[PDB]
Amino acid sequence: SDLIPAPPLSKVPLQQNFQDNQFQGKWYVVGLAGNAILREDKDPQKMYATIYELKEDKSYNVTSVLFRKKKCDYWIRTFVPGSQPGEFTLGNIKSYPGLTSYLVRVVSTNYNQHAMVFFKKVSQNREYFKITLYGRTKELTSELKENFIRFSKSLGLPENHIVFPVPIDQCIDG
Ligand SMILES: [Cl-]
Ligand SMILES: [Cl-]
Ligand SMILES: [Cl-]
Ligand SMILES: [Cl-]
Ligand SMILES: [Cl-]
Ligand SMILES: [Fe+3]
Ligand code: NA
Ligand code: NA
């Protein structure tokens, strides 16, 4: 009902010279921040993974897996290339009830260790945004994590809207 407003796109940098082929493969979600992301010490969020695969038409098949209720839950989406390289929109938006808008922007990455990706969506007329700290391994440095916190706070998010999922072995080691 009450949400921190989505930042203007001007405050969200784009990764220059984005190599879509180098971004393919498994990323661990080492950090999560957003207006719908709430820290919870009763049941801390478990780490999940996201796999990016380039298709023939240069769009990503994006498969994520998380460990929930003793089972691995998979969910798939298609990122269609947007206006500029490193920016995407959701394919087949009509298949998602309530969804009128969905934008993805890769803020930064070195392709072999870390990445930061900005997501923006409008669902049920409510505007959500999040930033994911991607890791090639399950652990990242304190320097990279503090940079993620800095960037998240620059978009208007407080600390309790920034979480670092706990590493697990189930589902995400495949
Ligand atoms: Cl949401
Ligand atoms: Cl993700
Ligand atoms: Cl789903
Ligand atoms: Cl949705
Ligand atoms: Cl670096
Ligand atoms: Fe989503
Ligand atoms: Na805009
Ligand atoms: Na659970």
- H helices of the chain, where? 142-154
The technique by which this structure was obtained is X-ray
In the chain, count of helices (H) and strands (E)? 1, 9
Residue 100 burial class via C-beta count within 10 angstroms: exposed 0-12, middle 13-18, buried 19 and up: exposed
CATH classification of 1-174 is 2.40.128.20, yes or no?
yes
Going by the annotation, the residues of the binding site are 48-50, 102, 121, 130, 134
Tell how far the Cα of 89 is from the centroid of ligand 6, in angstroms. 11
Residue 136 burial class via C-beta count within 10 angstroms: exposed 0-12, middle 13-18, buried 19 and up: middle
Going by the annotation, the residues of the binding site for a carboxymycobactin are 48-50, 121, 130, 134
Nearest ligand, measured from the Cα of 65: 2
User: Strand pairing partners for 119?
Assistant: 104, 130
CA distance linking residue 132 with residue 164, whole number of Å: 10
CA distance linking residue 30 with residue 82, whole number of Å: 26
Report resolution in angstroms. 2.3
Residues 6+ apart with CB under 8 A from 56: none
Terminal Cα distance for the chain, rounded: 38
DSSP string, 1-19: ---PPPPPGGGS---TT--
Spatial contact of 107 and 116, defined as CB atoms under 8 Å apart:
yes
Domain edges within the chain? 1-174
